[PDB]
């Protein structure tokens, strides 16, 4: 019962495969590199202006 030990346990067992494939809320990450703009500034998908 301490933040530190509680965090070190997860830092240790992050090497597990299930620990990376079942992040309780996050979901599987795949570790893919994105082109720095599609996450926040630009939205995904093809874009043709309507307005």
């Amino acid at each position: 019962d301490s933040e530190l030990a509680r965090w070190k346990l997860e830092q240790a067992e992050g090497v597990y495969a299930s620990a990376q494939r079942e992040p309780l809320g996050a979901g599987y990450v795949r570790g893919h590199r994105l082109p720095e703009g599609l996450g926040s500034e630009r939205p995904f998908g093809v874009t043709y202006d309507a307005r």
Binding site: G27, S40, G45
Partner: protein
């Protein structure tokens, strides 16, 4: 154009509690309640620069309610509007409809009255409840009854959460469901079913979140509700208000049960790869792999479908895709409705919640349809109701509370009458 939203039960107030986080994010309101016209359908400006929602969370157990009262949105909700009883109905329809409702519904309704009097151009009501529980089922039905005798003419959108066929967390929910429908028939104008297993399979398949808690479910349900009211909140190229579903989706005064669907439910990595266009999300909104109710529409025939489009959508290609759908022969319509569709287009794209798993996409589709698979669902609940009732199991709690066998038999034959109505209509 203003609409108020009431939340009954432990499930309903957790859902709308995800909804209001989404609404404040869509309108740029930080949770303390001040801005740094479009909002006026939900938040009424009052006090000092405060946009306080047109909503009442009401429930009997104070655990989740005061949880809200201490949470991040302490300053948002008007304190009086969160009604909280002292003790639960405890998954007992009779207890929530006769014992405890008799003290709570009058306070709830005469709050509702002064909210409607602050309101000016009230469109309608929309309720949030799960019919499996005790409070959301019992006093929810009692609340809808007294609201119908109060206004009657005003449209009431009921977003209910039905119990899944195999995945289930209670034992008496067949009793609660049957008794809840018996009033949901003749009080709600438009009732949308959303069970939990369908959302579970969606979160597993598309969103590839494999240990989904209730928030992920509530998060994307809030996305659906926000999507079908964005026409009221924001100006679109082709807008439809809350009165349209009343006319265009309910061919008969007792057939009002609507499957929901949403697309694209897509994560960040699956977005960078799929090309998001209109024709394929229109396709994606139609397979049972992306419906919010675990049912098989291939065994049923559609009555009328409605398609909300949000974001960057032009009317050309939506008309094209709908043409392709009507020319496909895998899915089929009834012989009554050659014009089996109703489209809608809005300009503002769906927003992202930080911490949520949905990426920012240019466009989205919310399908709300009407079919006969719902008639299959009610028979499914009817069978498992009859099995438990054959042995008179669990009945003594209702009888001990004050109910009897008359309404059990008559609610049973009421669902049998609904079944015969669906089988008569489908032909």
């Amino acid at each position: 154009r203003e609409v108020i939203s009431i939340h009954i039960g432990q499930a309903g107030i957790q859902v709308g509690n995800a909804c209001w986080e989404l609404y404040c994010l869509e309108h740029g309101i930080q949770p303390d309640g001040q801005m740094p016209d479009a909002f006026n359908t939900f938040f009424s400006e009052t006090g000092a620069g405060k946009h306080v929602p047109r909503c009442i969370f009401l429930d009997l157990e104070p655990t989740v309610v005061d949880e809200v009262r201490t949470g991040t949105y302490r300053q948002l909700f008007h304190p009086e509007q969160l009604i909280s009883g002292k003790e639960d109905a405890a998954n007992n329809f009779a207890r929530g409809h006769y014992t405890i409702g008799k003290e709570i519904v009058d306070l709830a309704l005469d709050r509702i009255r002064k909210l409607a009097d602050n309101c000016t151009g009230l469109q309608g009501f929309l309720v949030f409840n799960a019919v499996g529980g005790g409070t959301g089922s019992g006093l929810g039905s009692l609340l809808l009854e007294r609201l119908s005798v109060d206004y009657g003419k005003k449209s009431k959108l009921g977003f209910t959460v039905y119990p899944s066929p195999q995945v289930s967390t209670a034992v008496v929910e067949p009793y609660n469901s049957v008794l809840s429908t018996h009033s949901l028939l003749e009080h709600t104008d438009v009732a949308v079913m959303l069970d939990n297993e369908a959302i579970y399979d969606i979160c597993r398949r598309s969103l590839d979140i494999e240990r989904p808690t209730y928030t992920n479910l509530n998060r994307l349900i809030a996305q659906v509700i926000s999507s079908l009211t964005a026409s009221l909140r924001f100006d679109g190229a082709l807008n439809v208000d809350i009165t349209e579903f009343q006319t265009n989706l309910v061919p008969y005064p007792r057939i009002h049960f609507m499957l929901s669907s949403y697309a694209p439910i897509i994560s960040a990595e699956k977005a960078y790869h799929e090309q998001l266009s209109v024709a394929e999300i229109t396709n994606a909104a139609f397979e049972p792999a992306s419906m919010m109710v675990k049912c098989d529409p291939r065994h049923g025939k559609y009555m009328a479908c409605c398609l909300m489009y949000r974001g960057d959508v032009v009317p050309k290609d939506v008309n094209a895709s709908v043409a392709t759908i009507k020319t496909k022969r895998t899915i089929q319509f009834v012989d009554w409705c050659p014009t089996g569709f109703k489209c809608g287009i809005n300009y503002q794209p769906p927003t992202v919640v930080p911490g949520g798993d949905l990426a920012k996409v240019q466009r989205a589709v919310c399908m709300i349809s009407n079919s006969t698979a719902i008639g299959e669902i009610f028979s499914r609940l009817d069978h498992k109701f009859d099995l438990m009732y054959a042995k008179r199991a669990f009945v003594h709690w209702y009888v001990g509370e004050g109910m009897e066998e008359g309404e059990f038999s008559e609610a049973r034959e009421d669902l049998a009458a609904l079944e015969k109505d669906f089988e008569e209509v489908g032909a």
